[PDB]
Design a protein around this nucleic acid. Sequence first.
DNA 1: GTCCCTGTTCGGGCGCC
DNA 2: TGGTTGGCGCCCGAACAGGGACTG
Lengths: 400, 558
Amino acid sequence: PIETVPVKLKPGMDGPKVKQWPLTEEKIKALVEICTEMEKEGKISKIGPENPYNTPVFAIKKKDSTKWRKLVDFRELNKRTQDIPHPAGLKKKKSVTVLDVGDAYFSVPLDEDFRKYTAFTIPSINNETPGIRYQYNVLPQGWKGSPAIFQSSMTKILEPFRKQNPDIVIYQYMDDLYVGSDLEIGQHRTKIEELRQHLLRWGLELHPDKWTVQPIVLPEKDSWTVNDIQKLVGKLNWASQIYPGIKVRQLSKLLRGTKALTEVIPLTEEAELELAENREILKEPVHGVYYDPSKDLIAEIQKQGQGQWTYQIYQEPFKNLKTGKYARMRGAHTNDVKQLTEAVQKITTESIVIWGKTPKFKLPIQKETWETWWTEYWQATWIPEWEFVNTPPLVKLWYQ
Amino acid sequence: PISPIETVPVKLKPGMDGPKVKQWPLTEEKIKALVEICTEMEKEGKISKIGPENPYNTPVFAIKKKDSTKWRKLVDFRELNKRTQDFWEVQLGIPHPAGLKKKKSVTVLDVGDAYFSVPLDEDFRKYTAFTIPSINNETPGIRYQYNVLPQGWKGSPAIFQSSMTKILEPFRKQNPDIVIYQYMDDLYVGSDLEIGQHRTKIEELRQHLLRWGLTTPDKKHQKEPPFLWMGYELHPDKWTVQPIVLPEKDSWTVNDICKLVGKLNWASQIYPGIKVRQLSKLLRGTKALTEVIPLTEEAELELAENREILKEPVHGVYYDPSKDLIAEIQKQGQGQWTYQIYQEPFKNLKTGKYARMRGAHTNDVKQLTEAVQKITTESIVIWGKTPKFKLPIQKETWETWWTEYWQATWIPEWEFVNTPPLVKLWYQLEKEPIVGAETFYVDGAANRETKLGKAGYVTNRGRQKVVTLTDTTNQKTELQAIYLALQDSGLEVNIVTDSQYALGIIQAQPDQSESELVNQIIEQLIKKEKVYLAWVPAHKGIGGNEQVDKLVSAGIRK
DNA sequence: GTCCCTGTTCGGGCGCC
DNA sequence: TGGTTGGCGCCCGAACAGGGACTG
Ligand SMILES: *[PH](O)(O)OC[C@@]1(C#C)O[C@@H](n2cnc3c(N)nc(F)nc32)C[C@@H]1O[PH](O)(O)OC[C@@]1(C#C)O[C@@H](n2cnc3c(N)nc(F)nc32)C[C@@H]1O
Ligand SMILES: [Mg+2]
């Protein structure tokens, strides 16, 4: 039917060989039901152990629906896969809706020589059965090459809608379609449903206006102790690595000698003025920060406690492209891991809308803790890369 | 017979050729057994005679089977395995009897001559060439190649396990309510039918397997409990592990310690309270399995209390999905944790232990969290769900820990149980400076070349002390300085440090460490009533960090 | 750059099938 | 007997990666 496009791995790289992690009974039953239907329609085929590659698979369940979604953790294959103006107006729209257009890829065949690398394995409960393996025959959801090959077909489908609605920005990333407009809520939702009816012929909410930056703030006191000024000097000293205009001469000279931490230090007029000048400098935007599409985005997250989470997105140290906060549930039934997984999704969603790329996360969590529960709270169709850090208690104190 | 299933296409690694190793000398008994096996396998098409057109060879041998009567023909395919393609192993784990659901009727039967009944890829057969000596100087040694899966080849396990899955697929599809646990050639079959109707379903399975060339001999067809399965005995309403025999030595070697700990690990799945920390500690630094290691007093004590656990009768029960999974964790000494998983009180599904030491410095709450994570993952494998936990930690203790700890940490639904020793935090750092407590400014400095160092403090009350160190590091002198301040202060103390390394260790509130210096610091922190630890950036002239920095830098730096 | 001290992974021995 | 293969488990040490501090 459709001529296949030859795709190959990067030079000197083999396919992915990543082990399947344990899946719950509800996820395996969902994956088994999905794979039997996908196999019935020629989308996947069973394979044996002579295929040496493997990529982990799981499933997520949307909030209020008994429908599951098959997720293949393809980011190892995406890195090994051989390699458009990002819409700058998407981040300045009133409402943006995310639509899963992953089903569109299933109508385009995949290069026969490449299907071996799409292998995955369905596990069984209590190892009743060996793992049952499959590979992809069509463009797979979650693969970096799927939106690339389907690019020409996606433009044909979106052409009439984009012409009829020029004030609506439609952007595609992986299996997701981002639709932003300045229409009033309700009118916007009518256009989203209109586009859904448009996508059904072929077959088969975000408010980026309110995304604000969290600047570095400084304490305000009528009475300063030696401890208060020591905490303030160390914070401004770190901040001067980001804002070279920060000076700490008049504040630190108040600490000369060997004093008790609870001793009261009256701020002199010079130290008082130096502090006020530092507050204005911290309001200014970081200078000389230019986004490099060829370098990775790095996202660091700090647990601030009481449901508060701060994060920074940079490519070079102290060159923050964005610094924000993510405050959530403030109770005794708080789930740290759940709030963290939700935080990395919101941060990734923002990075896609702003720069069109997914960031690499430095997660403040034990590796085993994250891998045990992170899939239980995932709701996105993409998965970002992440490493696990042993955070210093210093960066936590700097970003409040 | 030989299965009519399609072969699995297998290639060598690029640029490689088949093995060319010659046969090693064999015993007369070994030879007589191999010719009897090879003559029969040739009559059945399982092996074919080759000639000079085949230039490969691999040494073969034989060992006794578990029944200890028949012989198991093996091939030392180590060279061929290096040059054979990679496989993706399909066996993802070992089934456990605690995950078996209660069935009305149970059968356990094996496929006979499993490997030798699955055909091998025709283009790959010539690489499995071997030579069997016969009655030499009366008839030369016959050269054969394998037409079926050989024992000793890398691909045989995964190819057989996958082939067995394809063969069982139509029967599972037709009989979705017949549970079939498939491990190698062994089949556990369970139904909710009466024993008569169950046996007819078994014969349908046997006929199904026979259609795919897999026999099921009656000698390996178990029909009554207890069933011998995967090293257990399956009774109708309970299961037990086959008897475990610990070594009986007076001069334990490293090999004996491995067999001891290995069998104890295997016993901990149903025997509660097994501990292997002191025994496994005896292996730190050893090199040879023959080294006789003298048992320490607590290692011999640990062995003695394990023996008493194994002398008790113990059994497990089967899984009822309509009830919840409950995991209860008991704290043992020195980072050791045992647990029991059950659904009805005093009816363990299984037990287990956890004692993996993670991190140089940790506390009992961190380890309990790690044990919960391990039990959760292990529960998802066996049962497909997370258990409800019963933990010997106060709700307030957990609230205090996850409040101050900078990492994301979480424990699923859990209820407190008063089973001492309870898990608690042995000290707490103040959030604010302490009024009326002496303020210590600590610092250390070490010389990278000479390894000489200095640690000390200055206080707001005029006290100062400097201690010289040898064979130290900058990081150690910073910890020595904090330790020095703790020793020379009262029950309440403010400490200011410039070392975020030392600050990060102490804020995590460890109660145990691999470092003796950190352990001495922990012991001081427990004796204190109030400690406040603060941080200042180094080399910035912030008093009195500036004063102590000049004291410890003199003579070792600049 | 190096040294230090973390962290994880991999492969060795043993255990079990 | 000794000499094979694969899965999983445990515990160990070697071999890495990543971040912070150090030298003149
Ligand atoms: P438990 O209740 O004792 O069950 C025994 C059994 C099963 C099922 O567990 C497997 N097994 C036990 N010990 C094994 C070793 N050392 N290696 C391998 F690969 N498997 C082992 C097999 C065993 O069932 P059994 O009926 O003995 O043999 C069946 C078979 C198959 C399929 O496994 C292979 N096999 C058995 N012993 C082997 C040895 N020592 N080496 C190799 F390479 N392969 C072995 C061949 C058989 O056809
Ligand atoms: Mg210092």
